[PDB]
Every structure is written in C-alpha cells, then in structure tokens.
Design a protein around this ligand. Structure first.
Ligand SMILES: Nc1nc2c(ncn2[C@@H]2O[C@H](COP(=O)(O)OP(=O)(O)OP(=O)(O)O)[C@@H](O)[C@H]2O)c(=O)[nH]1
Ligand SMILES: Nc1nc2c(ncn2[C@@H]2O[C@H](COP(=O)(O)OP(=O)(O)OP(=O)(O)O)[C@@H](O)[C@H]2O)c(=O)[nH]1
Ligand SMILES: Nc1nc2c(ncn2[C@@H]2O[C@H](COP(=O)(O)OP(=O)(O)OP(=O)(O)O)[C@@H](O)[C@H]2O)c(=O)[nH]1
Lengths: 55, 438, 427, 438
C-alpha cells in the first residue's frame, strides 16, 4: 500500500479552481474559427469582380 | 472560352474525384509536381489545361474543382498523398462533424456555416473563368455527407446563378443492397428537393459495374481503383469533346436541349460499349457494328433496368477515335429498322452523335483494354419507373411504422416534409407512365 | 541608474532575508564564498541594481540586518551565506526583546534608531539613485514591528520620493501563539497605512495548505516555506533585473494597481507548482499555467476572494512566451468571469512578460492581487481587539512603558475606517 | 534633395526602428559594418542611401534617424545588438527615468532638461541635410514614454519649424484590450495637444494585425518581430516612392494635400493587400484586379471599423511593382461603379494612385509572401467616429468617478486640462457627423 497512502496522504482533489475555459471553433483550420455563434469568422478569399458583401 | 467547374461532395464522392483528376493529368502529361518537361506550354494559362487546370504564370496547373468533405480522415490522407501539392488546400474543404447519414443534419446543422466559405470558393472560381458552361457535381443519393450538403449548396447556387448548366452525377442506390436503411429516407428527400432545380442528373449502380467486370473484364476481385477508373474514363470520354475535336463538336447545352424531353424528368442512363479485357481485345477485333449491338445489349447497362419492359426516348452515342460516318449511319439505320428496340413514336429521331478522332488511351498500371473506337452511350427509357417503384414500397412500409423518426424529429424536424416527398414521388411515377402512354 | 537597498527586520525577516538573498545568489551564479563564477552576461550586467562591487569580483549585498538577539544573527552569520554579509550592517541591541511592541517602539529603539539611521544613510550615499527600499518583517511579529514602525516613519520624511515597499507576514488566524499579537498587529497596522505605499500580506496557514496541496511532502522546514515565498518575492524583482518586452518599474506598476491612496495591501500569486510525479506528467503550455496561476487553491496570501470581487489584478510572466497567449487568455478570463470583476473598472488586468526563464524551469509567472478578501482579515482582528479591549487584558505592561488606551481607541477607528473604506468602494 | 529625418520615441518606438532599419539595409545590400564590398558606391554620400543613410567620406552609412527613450534597458541591448556599429551612439538618446505611463511626467518633469539635447541633434541633422522634406515620427498613443515626451517635442518642432511636413505613426488604443487603465487618460491628453499642430496621423491596431496573421499568414503563433516586419514593410512601401521611381512619382506633400479634407481630422487608414503565406501564393496567381478588391474588403483593415457604418472620403493606392495603367484604370473604373462602396458625393474623385516598378523583395528569415504586384492602401472614412465614441464613454465614467488623479495631481496638475480635451473630442464627433451630414 505504499502508493496508496503516499497518494491518500492529506486531502483528496477537489475543484475550487477558477473555471477558466476557451470555447473552440467547429473547424480544424488554424485560420478559420467559427462556433455555434460568430459563424462569420474566417479568412475571406480574394474575389476579382464582386467586392466584399456585394449583396 | 470553354470551361467548367467540378464539385465533389461526400467522402464517397471524393476518391472518384481523386481518380478522374489523376486520369486527366495523364493524357495531358501533367507531372505530379505541376510542371511540364522542357517542352514549352506554360503561359497565362491557355492550352489543353485552360478548360481543366489553371497553369498561370506560376507554371502550376490548378484543377478547377472544390473537394468538400465532413470528415478530416480521407481529405487529409490525400492531402498527404501524391498530387496534394497540385491541390489547393482550402478547395479540399475539410470537415469536422458528420451528418450521421442524416440529410437534415447535414442540410441544417453544419451546412449553414460552411456554405458561405463554399460560396466564397465558387465565386472565386466563377470569377476567374470566362466561358463557364456549367458545373460538375459529384455526389450520391445515399450520402452520409453527400446527401444533405449537396442539396443546400445547389439550392444556394441555383438562386444566384440560374443562367448556367448544372450537371449532377450520383451513384444510384443499389435496389437490393442497402448499406444503410436511412438511405431510402434521404434518397427520396434529395429527389423531391432536386426535382425543381437540378438540370442534368446522371445515375449509376456499382453492382452492375461489378457484374460487368467478371463477365468480360474477367476480374472476380476488382477494387474501387477498378471501379473509379471506369467512371473516371466515362467522364473523360464526355469531356474529350471539350478538350479534343472531331468531325462534329457537341456540348452539354446540346445535351441539355436534346436529351431531356420535358421538365421534371432529366434522368438519362450512361453506357460504354467497348468494355473488354486486354487479352480478349488482343486476339479479337472492334468495329462500329458489334459495339453498336453491344451498347444496345440490355445486360451491358450499369442500371438494373431491362429495356423491353420500357421504351426509349433519348439516346446519344459519342464516338471517340478513328471512325468514318459511312459505317455509322448505315449501322444506326439498321438499328432503326430493329423491332425489339421500341422507341416512343413521338420522336422519329432521338439520337445525338458525337465524333472525336482522338483514340482513347490506356492508363499506366491499369486494367482496361487498348481501344481505338469507343462510345459513351447516354440514353433514356421508360423502364426506369420500377426503380422508384421499388423505393416507394420500401419507404411506405418504413413511414407507416415510423421507424427511426425519433432521431430526425429529435434534432428539430417533422413529418410534413416527409409527406411532401411521397406525392412528389407519386407525381414522379404518374408522369412516367403517361409519357409512356402514347 | 536606479537601485534598491534592503532592510532585514524581525526574527522572521532574518529567516526571510536569509533565504531571500541566497536564492538570489544561487540564481546569479555566485558561490557561497562570494567569488562570482561568470556564467551569464546579463546577470553580470544588471546585478548592480542590488549589489555593489567589492574587491576581487565580490558582490556585496546592500541589505541591512537589524535585531536584538545575537543567537538568531549568530545563526544567520553561521549560515551558508553569512560570509557574503558584512559585520558592518550587523547592528543590534544589548537587550532581551520580550517582544513588547512598546519597548521596541519607544524604549529600545530610542538608542538604536540613531545608529541604524547612521547605517542606512552611509549605504544611501554609497549608491547614486534609488528606486526605493523594501522591508521584510511581520505585522504580528514582536520585535520587527517595533523597529519597522519606527524606521518607516523616519525614512518617510527624509526620502519622501521613493518606494516604501513593506513585506509583512500575517500570523495564523486560528492561533497567534503570542496572545498579545492582536495588540501588536492592531498597533502596527495603524501607522503602516499612512507611511507605506506597498504591502504584501502573507499567511502561514495558506502556505501550510500549499504543502498540503502540491508540495505533498508532509513535513517541510519553515525554510522550505521561506524558499517558496522568496521565489515569489524574487519573481516580482525579476522584472527590474532582467531585460525584455515588459515594463518593470514599480512606479510603472504601482500607479497601475493603486486607484486611491488607502490601497497598500496586496496579495501575491505564483505559477506552476508541481507534485512528486507530475513534473513529467505535465504538458507545459500557457493555458494550464493560466488555469493554474488563476486557481483559488494556488492562492497563498490570506484567503479566497470568492466571497468578494476583484479590484485590480497584475501578473508578471517569466519565460519564452509571447503576447498572443496572454492576450487570448485575458479575453478568455475576461469573458469567463466579467461579473466577478467590478463594474467600477473594466480592463483591470495589467500584464508583463519576462523573456528570461528562471533557473530550474522555463515557464513561470508571479501574480499580485488586489481584491475584497481583506475584510475577513481585519474583521477577525476587530473582534479580537474588541474582546481583549473589553476587559483590558494584559495591559498593565503597556501602561508601564507609558502607553495609554486612547492610542488604542483612535488606532482601531483607523482600522474601522478602512473597514468601511473597503466595503463602500465594492459593496 | 529628396531626403527626410526619422524619429523613434519610446521603447514602443525603438524596436520598430530596429526592425525597419533592419529592412532598409537589405535591399541596399548594407553590410553590418556599414561599408559595401569592393564594388564602388561610396563618395560624398550621394546614392540610393543618400535619402536614408549618410555614407560620408568615412565610407559607411549613417541612418538619418534618432532613437529617443527614457530607459537604458532596451536601448543598451540594441547598442549591444547587431547593427550598433552603424548606429550613432548619442543618436540613440537614452534616459535614466521613466514617465510611468504618465503623460505629464514625460511632458514636464524630465522632458525640459533633455529636449535641448535632442534639439542639438535635430539641428545638427538639419544643417547637414539639404532637402529635408519632413519627419518620420513613430510613437504610441498609450505611450508610457511615447505619449508625453513626443507631445512636447512636436510642439517645439512645430514652433521652430512650421514650413515642412511631419509624419506621425502610432499604434492605436486597442478597442477592447487595455494593458493599462491610465492609457485612456494620456490618450486624449496627447490628441488634444496634437490636433492643432499635427499634419497627418496614421494608426494601426495590433489585434487585427494578428487577425490577418492567423487568417491568411496561417501563423497562429507569430513573433513580435512579424508585426514589426509587416509595419516595417508598410513604411518601406510608402518610402519606395522616395527611393525608386515608377510611372509617376508622388511625394508626401501630395499625400498631405489630397487626403485630408479640412483641418483637425487628418487620420486616414493604411492597408497592404498582398498579405498571404508563401505556400498559398506558391500555387496561386496575383493581379491588380483581385488585390484591389482584397484591400477593399473590410476584414482586411487592421482597424476595428465597419466601413458600411461609415462613408468613404479619400483613398490612396501605391502600386509597387510591375503594373500597367490599362487593367488598373478599368478595375478602378469598376470600383467607382460599385454600390456597396459609399463615398461621400462631395468628392467625385477621392483616389491617389502611385505606380512604382520595383517588386517588393522578401526579408531573409521572413514569413511574408513573394510579391511583385503590391499596394499599401491609404484611405480615410467616416466610420472612425465610433472609435472615439468607443472612447468617450470609457472616459466620462472614469473622470466622473475621478480615478488615478491623485497620481496626477500628486505630481502637479489640475483637472481643467482634462476638461478642455473632452469638448475637444466632443468637437470631433460633431465635426465627424456634420461632415458625414450631406
Ligand atoms: N462514391 C462512392 N461511393 C462509395 C465508395 N465506396 C462505397 N461507396 C458507397 O457509397 C456510400 C457512401 O455514402 P455515405 O456513407 O453517406 O458517405 P458520406 O455522406 O460522404 O459520409 P460517410 O458516412 O462518412 O461515408 C456507401 O453506402 C457505399 O455503399 C466510393 O469509393 N465512392
Ligand atoms: N522565524 C520564524 N518566525 C515565525 C515562525 N512561525 C511564526 N513566526 C512568527 O513570526 C514573527 C516575526 O518574527 P519577529 O518580528 O522577528 O518576532 P519578534 O519581534 O522577535 O517577537 P516575538 O514574536 O515575541 O518572538 C514572530 O513573532 C513569530 O511568532 C517560524 O517558523 N520562523
Ligand atoms: N509601436 C509599438 N508598440 C509596441 C511595441 N512593443 C509593444 N508595444 C505596445 O505599445 C505599448 C507601449 O506603450 P508604453 O508602455 O507607454 O511605452 P513607453 O511610453 O515607451 O514607456 P514604458 O511604459 O516604460 O514602456 C505596449 O503596451 C505594447 O502593447 C513596439 O515595438 N512598437
């Protein structure tokens, strides 16, 4: 039982920690980053005739 | 000028895109790097590739296709493959979540946030090209990803770009083999959604492709590699008119005008006659006569449809290679004299001939034959209603006892759209016999 | 050039400063004897902020040691680095402390303040231009409180233009050992609030909880606790000595932490603390550090600000990292808990990045906290003060030295003022 | 002749001086020593360098820049860095005491005794030069030392010299990131002091520099140098007109006249279109037309503004490299015909074109693309008032609750100057809307 007590020593782990977290995107691309929200977050490619958000 | 854009949706419909692009670079002699030998062909991108590839001043041929996918596995392994340096990273539209064969999941949940990027891709390809005859969509009816995502994009590209053609290519569901029981669910759903927008949809079945190979190609154990090259050849033949010339040149617009009789139904069947093994071709001979008989032999079709139960409406033969009109017109005249061939009396003429002098070549390390005279037989007949007749009694049982509906309704859907498909199909068949009724 | 001179006070600060300087010596690569073994050019350059040059490349510490009891100093002198200290700064008294706050503040200091004033001003003229001074001591400590309160007062008027960095340890809330420590603490903090500009609050129980938590070695030495706290004190001082794309001046920092004058109590926070096998079970990346440095369990100063909210937060990041991770981490934590900040001030985070990793690890950081968690602290001592002043226990001594209760009344009002002063701003 | 003097203030202003000067030395082939190889370009100091560097009879280049800061740390490490032998020791103006983010600390406490010294530098710089078109000022609004010290000197540079131009560049306060909450206080303290003297201010924001970087440069973990290389490339392009020639040569005086409409507002926005990764440009092609739209796409601006929420006033494109007016004039003809682009109808013309034949080169050990057709897009729009609108509410709260002044009034100020600047700002938005009012 050497590992037990040397693990069971003191108290047992408990989360009083700050619940920090980052929501990730739905894409694996290290450049595109879109979630359930903010779906217009990606690199816009380069169109030649119609400018940005023509419609 | 004269060009088109290819679309390959679905991890099923991507390896077929892998083969055809691989096949295409061969007759052009495109090195996997993306540059020719010391022979001078580079420029602003104007040669045999200009319809297919984009070899600009950078000297690298860029295929004019977009590979959209929903699972990173297959799209990354090809991105680690042989021609990945040729391929553009974000036209290999990689995927992160799956539709789980659910058309609606692919159509609604993820499809919204990706189509804009695809819309971003398509306009960038649409803006650079000049002729832009149409689009080459590779998909599948029973698509775990092919079904839902193709439907949403074709809806979006229909509303904004409705003046160009839309060429659809999907595996027809196996009538008796079902890799998924949800497959009929979405398959009819796509048909009723695609009836009112799609321009030209061409279907095919793998079993008969497998039926052919151990009949005359004589392989009891083929592979997808064998399968995809066959269809990859098929699209190569139809695109040979686009690259090469011949006695007369024909185009998809002529195909659109001359094959589909009436609105709604635009579903012809393709065939290729000189399917044979190399050794069988070795000590035998090919000519227009027997291949004309072969292409009109019922068992040579890749779809489980027997012509004498139906009647022909549209037919087209695309002769690629060394052929003279003399034997052709006489042969097709004798075909016209044939009595078993029962065309619909509405059309006295129903054949579209395409002559190309370029002999179709073999693929290195391949299994096809060395053909001089080839033909792609895209035709249409009334013997197809049984295929949708099979699907309805398949579906009507399933819907009455509403199996698996809890999945679909669980993610936010209902029964009305499922209801609309059945009379859309019921409208589809009821049109089939009345045009069959003379 | 701007330098620092240290003061070592109380019998804890003797224990603190001993560990404090040896950590610095081991960091900079000087042997215990004092002959520096040239290993890093940057620490060769910017050691002058703290040490002066002696003969033969010996780096004389500019720290002053003050006490009354030789044995503690004898232990300090006999320590592994007592040789690097001078007999010059060894100034002390002939009296037994008793650690009465009054004897050290009025009786014993009277004949000792003159000498230590003479001391500190000689090393003051030895160097050119200070940033300021820093003091290690205790608020509940007996002898250090008396000397410190006297000296901080005198250094105020004579150099009113420098840093009054005070570094005091808060005794254990559950038990003060010294029963008259609450008298000592209440006396000390009264003159601390107006005289100082910076104060770090440290508690042993939280430090004991750290051994309970991550050190996981059951029985440490208090020197081990000194090792931990010295690392925190060293970490904030790594700013000045080391180059990098960070602003190090405490003035560049203090104006950024201090909205209003009454703010002097500041709470440290430290970065990766690791157990027996998790050194090779940890994937050292910024998100885990930021998670770990912002852990209520990682906190060691007083208690959990969970009961209150966050006024100003400042953390210095040591290692080969970049501004993007801290930026995206800052957005994460900002969006994580915006409500637990105060609507009084947004963007209350001030970040610094040190590109020079420590000796023993690459990724590290130190945090300094300003929240509403000190209410529980001085509210605790308030009931202690009121109860012990209810019946004037242990007072006949303090009346003997000449101290009166009116001092206690107006002193407690000052703390009671700070009770409302904290509460009104946040609550 | 055609030359200028550069000023770098603050440790925020010095690394970019290092980085940019690290850039300029490359295209000229400047060796670390300062001398060329045995090839002959040295003389009285009149060649490619004569506008930037002073390669006198000693034979080695002296950049015409002065690095001023208040701390010896970052200036010594560069004094011990790579290029210190070129750089002039006391042109590397160091300081021993910091302003502690306080505008007035760097404006009253120590500035008085040290500006005279830098006054000695500038006149000894001024006397040697001949053409002395203007000054290149790099600083930061949220300057711990950049804010206050620059404000005093520009006042003294304004009063003694009011006949020549002065070019200021500062990182703008981040819209939602604040590494200091006294960065707000000094900001309009700087701007209200500078509005009545400054000629033209160009600003950038780090976050969108990053947002570009992990969008198209594909670097999720850039370095602090990459920002400096990008902005260093930015000024390199604007100075390429100075260095080389092209179809037409344009000077800062023209940019001053044709950009700013009216006094006060002189705050346009720059943008460099061909920002892409090397592997992306590897198999893609660039021309003026598509990059023209790219620099007009709002997400490519490094300032957090929606141009659709504002209206366009002026725009400047500098085509550095091989371009011809033909495709340029037709392409810009199209952008005028565009409807989403909303210029003010006051100016039928609002564009300034600059053609330079030189293709922008790649920095060794770099991360940028391989650009032969490049443009930095200087433009000013009415969508900028939100940033100051973003500001003033950040301020009206803090001044009302009256924070940190004990630091400021502690070392000697009053609240009147903080008051005057708020209607100075309030004058700006009412100015900004009324010019937006047509
Ligand atoms: N087009 C094509 N179809 C194949 C291939 N191999 C098997 N199939 C058939 O095509 C169907 C694939 O459809 P789906 O499973 O919905 O494909 P998907 O929507 O892209 O997503 P997945 O479920 O991951 O495959 C299968 O049922 C097979 O019967 C192939 O190489 N190409
Ligand atoms: N050195 C040391 N001090 C400790 C320790 N634990 C608690 N302390 C307390 O830390 C306080 C600070 O030390 P000093 O200020 O020098 O104490 P002092 O003025 O000599 O007076 P007394 O507390 O009466 O002994 C002491 O009062 C101790 O009670 C420890 O482990 N080591
Ligand atoms: N323009 C520019 N800005 C930088 C650079 N490096 C960091 N910055 C940003 O600019 C800000 C610098 O402003 P200040 O802190 O006031 O700098 P300072 O006035 O020169 O004096 P210090 O406070 O001591 O640095 C930092 O907060 C950084 O976010 C740089 O190299 N160039």
């Amino acid at each position: 039982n050497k590992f037990s007590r040397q693990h069971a020593a003191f108290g047992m782990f408990q989360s009083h920690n700050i619940n920090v977290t980052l929501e990730k995107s739905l894409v694996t691309g290290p450049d595109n980053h879109i979630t359930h929200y903010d779906r217009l977050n990606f690199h816009p490619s380069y169109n030649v005739n119609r400018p940005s958000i023509c419609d | 000028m004269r060009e088109c854009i290819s679309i390959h949706v679905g991890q099923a419909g991507v390896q077929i895109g892998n083969a055809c692009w691989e096949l295409y670079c061969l007759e052009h002699g495109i090195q996997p790097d993306g540059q020719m030998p010391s022979d001078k062909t580079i420029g602003g991108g104007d040669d045999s590739f200009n319809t297919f590839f984009s070899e600009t001043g950078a000297g690298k041929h860029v295929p004019r296709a977009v590979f959209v996918d929903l699972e990173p596995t297959v799209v990354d392994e090809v991105r680690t493959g042989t021609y990945r340096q040729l391929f553009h990273p974000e036209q290999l539209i990689t995927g992160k979540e799956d539709a789980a064969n659910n058309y609606a999941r692919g159509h609604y949940t993820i499809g919204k946030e990706i189509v804009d990027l695809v819309l971003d891709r398509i306009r960038k390809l649409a803006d650079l090209c000049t002729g832009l005859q149409g689009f080459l969509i590779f998909h599948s009816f029973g698509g775990g990803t092919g079904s839902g995502f193709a439907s949403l994009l074709m809806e979006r590209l229909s509303v904004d770009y409705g003046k160009k053609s839309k060429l659809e290519f999907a595996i027809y569901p196996a009538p008796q083999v079902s890799t998924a029981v949800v497959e009929p669910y979405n398959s009819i759903l796509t048909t009723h959604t695609t009836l009112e927008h799609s321009d030209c949809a061409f279907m095919v079945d793998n079993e008969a492709i497998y039926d052919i190979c151990r009949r005359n190609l004589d392989i009891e154990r083929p592979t997808y590699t064998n399968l995809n090259r066959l269809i990859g050849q098929i699209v190569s033949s139809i695109t040979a008119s686009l690259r090469f010339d011949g006695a007369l040149n024909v185009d998809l617009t002529e195909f659109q005008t001359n094959l589909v009789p009436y609105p709604r139904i635009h579903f012809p069947l393709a065939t290729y006659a000189p399917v044979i093994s190399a050794e069988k071709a070795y000590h035998e001979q090919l000519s227009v006569a027997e291949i004309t008989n072969a292409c009109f032999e019922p068992a040579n079709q890749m779809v489980k449809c027997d012509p004498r139960h139906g009647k022909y409406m549209a037919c087209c033969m695309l002769y690629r290679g060394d052929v003279v009109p003399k034997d052709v017109n006489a042969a097709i005249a004798t075909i016209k004299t044939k009595r078993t061939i029962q065309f619909v009396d509405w059309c006295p003429t129903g054949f579209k001939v395409g002559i190309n002098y370029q002999p179709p070549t073999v693929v290195p390390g391949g299994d096809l034959a060395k053909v001089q005279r080839a033909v792609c037989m895209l035709s249409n007949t009334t013997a197809i209603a049984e295929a949708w007749a099979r699907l309805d009694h398949k579906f009507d049982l399933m819907y009455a006892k509403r199996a698996f509906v809890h999945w679909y309704v669980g993610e936010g859907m209902e029964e009305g759209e499922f209801s609309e498909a059945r009379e859309d199909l019921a409208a589809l068949e009821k049109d089939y016999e009345e045009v069959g009724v003379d | 050039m701007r330098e620092i001179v240290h003061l070592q006070a109380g019998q804890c600060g003797n224990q603190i400063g001993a560990k404090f300087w040896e950590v610095i010596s081991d960091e900079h690569g000087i042997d215990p004897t004092g002959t520096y073994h040239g290993d890093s050019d940057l620490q060769l350059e910017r050691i002058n902020v703290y040490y002066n040059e002696a003969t033969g490349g010996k780096y004389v510490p500019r720290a002053v040691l003050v006490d009354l009891e030789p044995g503690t100093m004898d232990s300090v002198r006999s320590g592994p680095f007592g040789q690097i200290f001078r007999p010059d700064n060894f100034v002390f008294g002939q009296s037994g402390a008793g650690n009465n706050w009054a004897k050290g503040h009025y009786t014993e200091g009277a004949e000792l303040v003159d000498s230590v004033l003479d001391v500190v001003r000689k090393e003051a003229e030895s160097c050119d231009c200070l940033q300021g001074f820093q003091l290690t001591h205790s608020l509940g400590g007996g002898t250090g409180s008396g000397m410190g309160t006297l000296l901080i007062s005198k250094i105020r008027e004579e150099y009113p233009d420098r840093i009054m960095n005070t570094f005091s340890v808060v005794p254990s809330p559950k038990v003060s050992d010294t029963v008259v420590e609450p008298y000592n603490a209440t006396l000390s903090v009264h003159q601390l609030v107006e005289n100082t500009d910076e104060t770090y609050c440290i508690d042993n129980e939280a430090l004991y909880d750290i051994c309970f938590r991550t050190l996981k070695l059951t029985t440490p030495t208090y020197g081990d606790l000194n090792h931990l706290v010295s690392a925190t004190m060293s970490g904030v001082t790594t700013c000045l000595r080391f180059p990098g794309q960070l602003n190090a001046d405490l003035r560049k920092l203090a104006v950024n932490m201090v909205p209003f004058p009454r703010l002097h109590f500041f709470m440290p926070g430290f970065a990766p603390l690791t157990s027996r096998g998790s050194q090779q079970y940890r994937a050292l990346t910024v998100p885990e550090l930021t998670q770990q440095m912002f852990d209520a369990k990682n906190m060691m100063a007083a208690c959990d600000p969970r009961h209150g909210r966050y006024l100003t937060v400042a953390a210095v990041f040591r290692g080969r990292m970049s501004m993007k991770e801290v930026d995206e981490q800052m957005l994460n934590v900002q969006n994580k808990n915006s409500s637990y900040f105060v609507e009084w001030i947004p963007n209350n985070v001030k970040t610094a990045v040190c590109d020079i990793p420590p000796r023993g690890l690459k990724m590290s950081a130190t945090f300094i906290g300003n929240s509403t968690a000190i209410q529980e602290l001085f509210k605790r001592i308030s009931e202690q003060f009121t109860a012990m002043f209810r019946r004037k226990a242990f007072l006949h001594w303090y009346t003997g030295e000449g101290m009166d209760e009116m001092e206690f009344t107006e002193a407690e009002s000052n703390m009671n003022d700070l009770v409302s002063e904290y509460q009104q701003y946040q609550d």
